[PDB]
Each structure stands twice: as C-alpha cells, then as structure tokens.
Amino acid sequence: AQKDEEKMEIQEIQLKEAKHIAEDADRKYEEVARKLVIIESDLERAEERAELSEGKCAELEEELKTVTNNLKSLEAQAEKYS
Template sequence: MKRRWNSRKSNSKKLVIIEGDLERTEERAELAESKCSELEEELKNVTNNLKSLEAQAEKYSQKEDKYEEEIKILTDKLKEAETRAEFAERSVAKLEKTIDDLEDKLKCTKEEHLCTQRMLDQTLLDLNEM
C-alpha cells in the first residue's frame, strides 16, 4: 500500500509539475500570440506604407521623366540662344567697326570740306581785292 501511496504521491507531484508547466506554457503561448498579433499589425502598417511609398516613387519617377524632358528642351533652347548671341556679338563687332570707319571717313570729309571752304573763302577774298 505504501507503494501505491508513494506512486499516487509521485503522480500527484508530477501532475502539479505538469500543470505548472502547462500554465507557464499557456502564458508563453498567449504572449507569443499577442506578440504575433502586434507583429501582424505592424506588418500590415509596413505593407501599407510600402504601397504608399511605391505609389509616390512612381509619381516621382514620372515627374523626374517630365523634368528630364524639360531640362533637355531648355538645354536645347539655351544652346540656340547662345548661338544667336554669338552671332549677334559678331554682328555688333562688325557694325561697330563699320561705325568707326564711317566716323573716320566723316571726320576726313569734314576736314576736306573745311579746307575747301577756306580755299573758297581765300579765293573770294583774292577776287574782291582785285
């Protein structure tokens, strides 16, 4: 009978230990399930953020393509404007040279006119003295 009693006592201890283990395991399972729920919610949020970021990336990619095209157009316009400016600068230089040449010619012509005027005045004086 002692054996039965020891066996029952041993079984009771084992049962208490197993029930304690079960309780701790259930608590761990609840914590793990809670953590799993939190992680699932976080994953859901991260997935939504990722989708939002992907949509923004697509939008920005389209804007980038648009801006690159605008930059190309503006670069072409700039090159064209620079070419026109260089041509205009050469034209201005030619015109300034022409103006300088004409001013020199005008100065010479005025000097010749002044000389001719003096000669004419002198001739008239000479004629009046005769």
C-alpha cells in the first residue's frame, strides 16, 4: 500500500503537468487559427484585385487594337485622296 501511494502521488503530479501542457496547446491552437483566418482573407482580396486589373488590361488592349486599325485605314484613304 505504501508503494502504491508513492505511485499515486507521482501520477498525480504527472497529471497536473499534463493539464498544463494541454492548456498551452489549446492557446497555441486558437492563436494559429486566428492567423490563418487573417491571411486567407488577404488572399481573397489579393486574388479579386488581380482579376479586376487583368480584365481592365484586356479591355484597354482591345480598344487600342480597334482604334489603331481604323486610324491606319483612314491614313491609307488620306493618301488615296491626295
């Protein structure tokens, strides 16, 4: 019985240490979750703004093409009327 009491108290201090380790891990978990949420929100915004920029670039490119071609044709016609 004496030996068993010894083992009981040893396991008792071990259990307290275990609980503390558990709480520390819990706090770390909450922290990392917060960080991940923030960074992912930033990812959303970054992707969306990238898309906006790409679309606008496309539209401006097309308009440039059209106007340039019209100008070239009218230049040819100016020579013709000369």
